[PDB]
Fold:
Amino acid sequence: KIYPKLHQMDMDKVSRVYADLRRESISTGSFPITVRHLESILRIAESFAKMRLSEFVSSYDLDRAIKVVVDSFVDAQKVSVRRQLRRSFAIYTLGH
Amino acid sequence: SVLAAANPIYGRYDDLKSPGDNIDFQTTILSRFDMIFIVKDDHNEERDISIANHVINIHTGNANAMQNQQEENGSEISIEKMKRYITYCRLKCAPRLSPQAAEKLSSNFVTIRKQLLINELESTERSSIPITIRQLEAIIRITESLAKLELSPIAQERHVDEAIRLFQASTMDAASQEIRRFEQELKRRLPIGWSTSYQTLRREFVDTQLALDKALYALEKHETIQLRHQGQNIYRSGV
Amino acid sequence: FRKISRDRGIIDKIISSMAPSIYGHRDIKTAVACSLFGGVPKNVNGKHSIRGDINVLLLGDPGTAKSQILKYVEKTAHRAVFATGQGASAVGLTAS
Amino acid sequence: IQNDFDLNTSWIMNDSEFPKINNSGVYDNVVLDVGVDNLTVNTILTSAEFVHDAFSNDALNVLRGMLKEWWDEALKENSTADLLVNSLASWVQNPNAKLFDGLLRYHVHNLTKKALLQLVNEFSALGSTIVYADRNQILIKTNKYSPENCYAYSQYMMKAVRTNPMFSYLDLNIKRYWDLLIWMDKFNFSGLACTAVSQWQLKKFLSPIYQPEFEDWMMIILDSMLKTKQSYLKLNNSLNGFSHLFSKPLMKRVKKLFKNQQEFILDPQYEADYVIPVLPGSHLNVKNPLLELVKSLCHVMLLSKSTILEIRTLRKELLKIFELREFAKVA
Ligand SMILES: Nc1ncnc2c1ncn2[C@@H]1O[C@H](COP(=O)(O)OP(=O)(O)NP(=O)(O)O)[C@@H](O)[C@H]1O
Ligand SMILES: [Mg+2]
Structure:
């Protein structure tokens, strides 16, 4: 029954997240950040809004979706670099 | 028309490996593709930002209005209009190359053949992509299609220009993929900020010999050297 | 459903409810919740159809409830099927 | 042949700019404001076809030996010889010099560039770290915490540089001691010297009603950073938590100023103080001057590499006042 819409989502928040994830994903052994992962953020934000039975996706749904994807990427790493990546991406997640 | 899509072997295209290693398809079947595009992530930040803004405009649903605007503007056409138009071009027109276009295509063939010869000598290995006479037929075919868009009864020289541009943008990039001493001799002899005219470097190293221009290419790829002033001045710009 | 959904804590109450007898593993339960609600499938002007589904991979050590999480979802989803390893075949997976 | 245009010659004539280094940040270490002079003279002295825009090596050797002659006679206090050596920097550049040569000016210039980088290499090789460098000045992070501990170590450091033959003739001069330094460029910085100074070209682009406000909050930020530095040192990157000494007052103040702007930005009684100034290099238009002040203050505080997260959260909660999203291009 429920079909959320991305009404007035924070584009630049997501775009900077994708740009930084892509830049740090240049590491040739890491999880391959790709355009379908950007779509994943948008799908996930819709899924959280679906859990709320919500016609509209909120910033909180999108922030949680970003946090899920960023955590998924950050933990896909050799431990020699995980702390630095956590520190860098914290500017996007620790606003929530 | 076979329009085929494939991933490289090893998943992402591996720049340290040859295209014949990155690709499972044999040279026989590869020759049958008039154009091969090898597509890679640049990972450039401005490109990825542009893609991200575009993708979010797709998901937010503005793209429906955007395409409708572009179609009312005539900057885009609908699927059915383009389908009818493709059928109209296919049934009404079949262009021929002008004599000037025919000579230009022949000269471009010998040009890219010379380019493949120097590349195969340089790499001392034969390419996975065969740039045989069969590939000139592909460039002819592309030229004819380009003229076929506008229903022009002749394919003019401009259509050969665009056909050559597309072949250079696709199959040539699919195909076109001791110095240790000369490079550091140049690092010693040319200090930072000053310029060496290429002709003197040619005389100086050849009199000791094509390792020269690989040393130029390597020091050009790094920031250390920068070809400058129509390529006549070798400028030690970086470290 | 309407009544309980407008609780501002509903997302975490759902995620805690996911596979309730499995302790911890809150990121798995989050990913499972997201997948099981899904995004929104789309098609721009009929030209460009976009996946609504969210695909999740549980990669990890033996005895960490990954199989039991799948067996939970098998009971929980409306349409679902479960296949294991060499018990599958390519045609048995897509169509035959 | 000098009548003709030439691409090397025109590059030689047109080009001059140093690759000046500017490592912006907050610095709780003491920072040495090293003045420099005699870099041209020192490099001409310490200097040392296939290369076609290098000045003639023979003529350069004559210039070096002659400058050594002049320098020795200046050491013996021939006042005319000292006046000569001081004036050499003009002659190597002055096109009215009878022996002016573009290749000479350029050869001297890029040697000066290389030597400035080698001076930076030496200072960093001695364990310090460079905030800023150009042909007249170097600012250096010391890896030390108090000026009263460092008046010996700084003079050791400077002497250890000048005793290297590459820099034998430099006028290395510790022109200031900074206890605490906030730095983004040499026209936009503040710090405590050993006493607080503040200069910001950023301030000049705020509208008049907000220029006093910017300076007041800059003093508050400096005071908070100072309190936090000495607090950390009594407990024993030291800045961690400094925002907490003023953040809530700042948000209260900014809420009040936003209300006042909504009341008065339109008003002919007050609009004059909301006019954004026209200035040299006035880069861009702006529609909300309070937002310009907040952007400036957050940017200054975001220079603090150790503490980015607390400033980032404060920046979010400030930008919430305008209903501006945290990463919106307006913000
Ligand atoms: N957090 C947990 N809470 C409850 N039971 C758990 C938990 N972790 C593991 N188990 C138990 O571990 C047993 C095996 O779980 P299983 O689903 O096979 O884990 P697994 O990660 O899939 N192991 P594997 O099949 O080797 O990959 C089950 O009987 C679970 O009850
Ligand atoms: Mg299992």
